[PDB]
Amino acid sequence: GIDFKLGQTISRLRDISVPAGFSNFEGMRSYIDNIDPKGAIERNLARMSPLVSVTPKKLTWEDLRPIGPHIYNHELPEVPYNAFLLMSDELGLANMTEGKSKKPKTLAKECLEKYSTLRDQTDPILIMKSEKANENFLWKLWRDCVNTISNEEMSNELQKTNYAKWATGDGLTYQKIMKEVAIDDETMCQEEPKIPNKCRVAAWVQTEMNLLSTLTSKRALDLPEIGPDVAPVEHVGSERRKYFVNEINYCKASTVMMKYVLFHTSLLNESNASMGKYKVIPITNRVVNEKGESFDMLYGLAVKGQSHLRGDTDVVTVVTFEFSSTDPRVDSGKWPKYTVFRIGSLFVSGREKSVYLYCRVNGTNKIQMKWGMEARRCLLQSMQQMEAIVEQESSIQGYDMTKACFKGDRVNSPKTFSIGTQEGKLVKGSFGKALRVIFTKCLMHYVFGNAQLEGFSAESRRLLLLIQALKDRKGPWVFDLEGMYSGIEECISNNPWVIQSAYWFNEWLGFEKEGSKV
Amino acid sequence: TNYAKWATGDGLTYQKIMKEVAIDDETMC
Amino acid sequence: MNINPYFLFIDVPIQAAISTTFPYTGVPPYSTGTGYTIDTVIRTHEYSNKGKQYISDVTGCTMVDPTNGPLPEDNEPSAYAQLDCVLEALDRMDEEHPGLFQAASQNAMETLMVTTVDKLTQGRQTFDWTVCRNQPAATALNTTITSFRLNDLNGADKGGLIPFCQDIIDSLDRPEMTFFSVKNIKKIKRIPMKVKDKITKVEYIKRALSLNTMTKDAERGKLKRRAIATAGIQIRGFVLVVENLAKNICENLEQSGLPVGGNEKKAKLSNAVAKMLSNCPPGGISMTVTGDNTKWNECLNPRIFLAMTERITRDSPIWFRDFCSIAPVLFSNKIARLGKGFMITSKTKRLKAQIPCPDLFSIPLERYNEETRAKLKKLKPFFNEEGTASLSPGMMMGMFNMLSTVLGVAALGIKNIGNKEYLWDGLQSSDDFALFVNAKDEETCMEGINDFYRTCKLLGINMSKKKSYCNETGMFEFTSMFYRDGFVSNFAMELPSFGVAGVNESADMAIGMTIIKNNMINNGMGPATAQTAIQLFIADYRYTYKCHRGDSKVEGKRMKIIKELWENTKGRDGLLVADGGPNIYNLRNLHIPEIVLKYNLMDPEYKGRLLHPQNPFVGHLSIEGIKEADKKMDYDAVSGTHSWRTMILEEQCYAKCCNLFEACFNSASYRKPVGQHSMLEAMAHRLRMDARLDYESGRMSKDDFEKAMAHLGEIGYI
Amino acid sequence: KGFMITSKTKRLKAQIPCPDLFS
Amino acid sequence: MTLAKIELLKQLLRDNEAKTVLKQTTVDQYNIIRKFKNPSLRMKWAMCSNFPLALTKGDMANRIPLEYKGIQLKTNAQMCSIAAVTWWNTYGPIGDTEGFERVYESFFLRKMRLDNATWGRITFGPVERVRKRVLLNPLTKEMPPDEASNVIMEILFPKEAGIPRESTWIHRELIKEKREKLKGTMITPIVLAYMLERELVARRRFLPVAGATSAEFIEMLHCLQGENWRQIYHPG
Ligand SMILES: [Mg+2]
């Protein structure tokens, strides 16, 4: 047969890998083979201390308390706007086009040629400088971007490449030295970690959520066609997709998502192509309105730094200048990271409005660059929930329920959802409005996503499920509520979305408390 | 030789930059 | 009006609207991992400080044994699992399943006796000791075999995996160990060459027991990063056999949520909850506890796994018992390589330097930050000079998943303590468990939950009091799937699959479309959702492969050629999407390759052009991936121009030898060759037979026959 | 040769030519 | 070929490395020898590179110019660019298509069943489904994997067929039919072998089924079934 036999080193490793109370593996073998336990668990539990226990405790509405009370503290600073690109304050320089697709450089050149007043604006007017950002460096970089885009050549590399090394901060980098010098050196100490600042609720997140769930005349999301459908199931799927895309196509969140996706596509392509040069990258989008006209929208420019990406997490610096019409002085606490300039003004239909240029230095990496190319997965996340709801409704009544759910049938009334509140009075909204709210929520989970958001969502799932069980009169029990609350609250530090989600959770919990009396 | 570069302090030499960046920088005195 | 998304929950159950709560649309967090590994080691040894501390004479490391230690006196995690309690649980489980341990052991032995060394080529990156790095399974396996050849170890060429494991065990006894090491010789260029290096016995043993560490990347449900461990090749076979035995045992268990995936687990959840509800007494209550074990990898002692394997194989041949008890022993004496060291910087001098692991304590601890300072102060006792941590107690997640599930089901199988008026049972799968307790009043249900908590603590299982809660039966969670009133709201995690998946055009298309079909079948993806997924995948595919519609005015290198093809071919509906052709995939035809779908619609000239029998892009050596795609997934495609494919000296030599072998043996590609002789002898015999057949068949002249025979004689096989 | 300016925190130096003495 | 084979073997043995590896690695170990993190990003980067494709050495490269309409295709350093594939699909060698009409019979039969099938009404009520072991795709003749491999070897590997087992005679009709149909083609034997394995080896899975169980309906299970909807489908 087989005579697999152990040597000496392995035998001695086996000898010293035995639980306490045995001198050799043979002792363990004999003990396990012969000894017959007859309730060792009962004895151990009997002699186990009484202080060790789940300490179960029934959960009631009173035990549930607001999460992250410090967000209501007025001493802490208002959360700043840390998103990569402007979302609700975005300004898009629009030029109508027949539909022909051209390179981003030419598209940006034409867009800037249309707006020559901003293109030729060489004398800036600084409105606010964040803390450190040198206004001179940022303005010189912006002028370099404008000149590089407007130059007749077809190269997309900045014409200086030597001033930009310092304007972007690439030059100010520590230089590596061999380990022995560091050992001998005494001043070289390990850098302390950067603990995120603790902030309070802000009014800009709520306004952004309100604005980005609203219909707009500009539809940007376009998707590839699929093959003809002949079976009933695919016809039903096409109908539901038609309603869903009709609702979501014309919402500002869709345009923001498409802008993000296109910008990240361009950024990743440039990083893959250009390695050792400073690149100019327009923030471009294609937008089609109700009339069918197509426009190219230029939302600013970006300087992509020295893309020497070795691995994936290696950082690449991007200096973004973005057009906007919002005066940051109205809400100063929202823009402590942005060095803005007042670059011009324009008339939309005869009403003049100023145009500021928000300049900010940020960083990205291959993971973020790619995952910004998959923001349509937010669209699928939105689709799944509405599909589930419509399937439930059509399960209740035999005939398909989509039309009544959205527009209303001759036998059923349109379905509505509790959308928000005003003056403490909750308000209702159509199914399309709830769809847009869900889409905006998913888009914000994408844009404002980081470790803090993942932790907060995962740990607040417990609270949501507990509240759901409490609603169903299931009498949920929690063994240690304060530990769960602390775990949830340790993630409410700096992410604007996490703080606003905590505020919304507290508001909804209060409303549930008030309505639970019935 | 690498160790002697830092032991003698020759490695702690200030970098030279263009006049344009320096004048555009307010922290250079 | 202020929009509040949470108000949706007022109109919809949280379970139904739970999909939108997942932030699986953003960027997953990504990571030096040395700090995380140090926290892991400190925490693992902190839960077991009250055990027995000694010195490993074999390795000289500091070992800690919490098993059979003092019982816990508080609510912190404890690894002091009593052996006799575990034996009691195993005996009860075996009684409940007559002849299950024996059958699983015998089946594992049977499947082991037929396994070959080549099976070790499966899996993920493994720790290569010859270079002390992370190398693919096949590369590390062949490197270890070649190095064994130098130290007089000839088991791998014997075929079966038993001789290879025997020679691995023997390698731990040889006074020295010779192998090939990479030498980056300076010449300026850094040329990598092979150096015949030699190491001593203790260092080689430490290398064998070492478990390389890395920082997790794909985790998205936590705000902090943890450490994953990759083992070497000296343990992969033993761990494979033990895991196979554990899977054999836990396949029969009804309480086990493994090995099952897709829709089977939903049915298991529903069946378990229905069975529990039916068994509920008249007038009693069934409470369901949604549980989530704390870490639970750092409290499972490998010695408990050794005892469990010993008890499972009580009536097996001694050789199989010893073979099965080699992974746990090599785990109880494991060593953790602590990342790549820290980084210290001088701000005033604008300098930075990485301090490698071996010299962590060469710097006074006052030069580390407070967190790292305390970490190193606590880690000093278990720090090896070479730059590794002696991590005996606890386990690294991912190694023993089936065995730990068996332990959890053993805990669940107790069903009662003190004959009290309650019965508990539930589901357990790889750190995720759910419980159900039937009693007469909620007070007794909570008493049963407390008893279960204490019993689990006695076995080393520590369930979170923060991550777990309880309610009435009919609503709970398990492995991220939410059950509520019979409607299993299978969470939506299907996002990280819609997008080009790798190797090439046809394979990516087939993989994506089969993914859509599988999601529709299992997770209940709807028609509209599937169509939207197809649309998004088409968009991503067209962008990535630079293959847009011909009529579209997009500009690019391949776009000009696609534009020319658009009008150069009359039938515009037969071209693949790879060539800018229109998409025909819909809900009904997601199981059929697109080449065959448009086959009727292709112009004869176009199909002849694309489907040429000989294609330089398609290489016989690149067909390995036609069957399976990396998890191993099967996809159906059609060979064509789009089936293309995207150390140096060894690569050339091997590749060429394998290509010549494949050319001589046309069946080697399709089926695995079997033979205990050198490749040269088989190749020479095949060539001689082919030459004789060709000469006898009139396909080869007498002069060529003489030339070939002279060549073969020169080779030395006449 | 003009004058010289330097930032210690950034460890940078530059030379300002005579014409740029007032810029 | 035999002269070419012996010449290649002699040229290979001329190197010490080839000699040692050939004389040291056994036939069993050959598998390991033939085996030498984020596929999405790597493929993305490869796509925009000048020459991502690894073109095998051969005589077909001469058919495609290195540059075409000012677009680079191939270099002599082989490496190739997707533009070469697109041109090949535009203009290039015209192959023999009769092989596909018989080699890829499973897919063609799948398409025929899809095309000639008739659909009906859709019911949106809750659907009762049961976990059952079902065969995903229809089989011409199912047999155990070892017997399937033996049959495929006997089909497309006439040599290496010494001492026929007690399986060729059982499936003699299948053997002769496949031998006759597969003749006249030139596709690589690996693709044919894998296709025959797919045709012969049965793939079964635990799936939720409500109604028809035959593989014809299982193929379209993704469209026929539904958690809260059902469809009537008659395969062609
Ligand atoms: Mg759970």
Residue numbers in the entry:
A (entry chain A): 199 to 716
B (entry chain E): 359 to 387
C (entry chain B): 1 to 31, 34 to 189, 201 to 643, 652 to 667, 681 to 752
D (entry chain D): 353 to 375
E (entry chain C): 1 to 36, 43 to 83, 91 to 249
Give the authors' words:
In the nucleus of the infected cell, influenza polymerase (FluPol) uses the viral genomic RNA (vRNA) as template to perform synthesis of either capped and polyadenylated viral mRNA (transcription), or unmodified anti-genomic copies (complementary or cRNA), which then serve as the template for vRNA synthesis (replication). ANP32 comprises a folded, N-terminal leucine-rich repeat (LRR) domain followed by a Glu-, Asp-rich intrinsically disordered region known as the low complexity acidic region (LCAR). First, it stabilises the formation of the replication complex, an asymmetric FluPol dimer comprising a replicase, which is part of a parental RNP and synthesises the genome copy and an encapsidase, a newly synthesised apo-FluPol, which binds the 5’ end of the nascent RNA replicate to nucleate formation of a progeny RNP.
Several different pseudo-symmetric dimer structures were determined at 2.8 to 3.1 Å overall resolution, almost invariably comprising an encapsidase paired with a variable partner. The dimers have a 2-fold symmetrical interface, although the peripheral domains of each monomer can be in quite different conformations. The apo-FluPolB dimer interface involves the PA-arch residues 375-385 of one monomer contacting PA/332-338 and 361-364 of the second monomer, and vice versa. In addition, the tips of the PB1 β-hairpin of each monomer (residues 360-363, closely associated with the PA-arch), interact with each other across the 2-fold axis. The core dimer interface buries only ~2200 Å2 of solvent accessible surface compared to ~3600 Å2 for the FluPolA symmetrical dimer. The apo-FluPolB dimer interface involves hydrophobic (e.g. PA/F335, Y361, W364, I375, M376, V379), polar and salt-bridge interactions (e.g. PA/D382 with Y361 and K338, E378 with K338 and K358). Even the core conformations vary due to different openings of the polymerase. We used the split luciferase assay to show that mutations in the symmetrical FluPolB dimer interface significantly reduce self-oligomerisation in cells, suggesting that this dimer likely exists under physiological conditions.
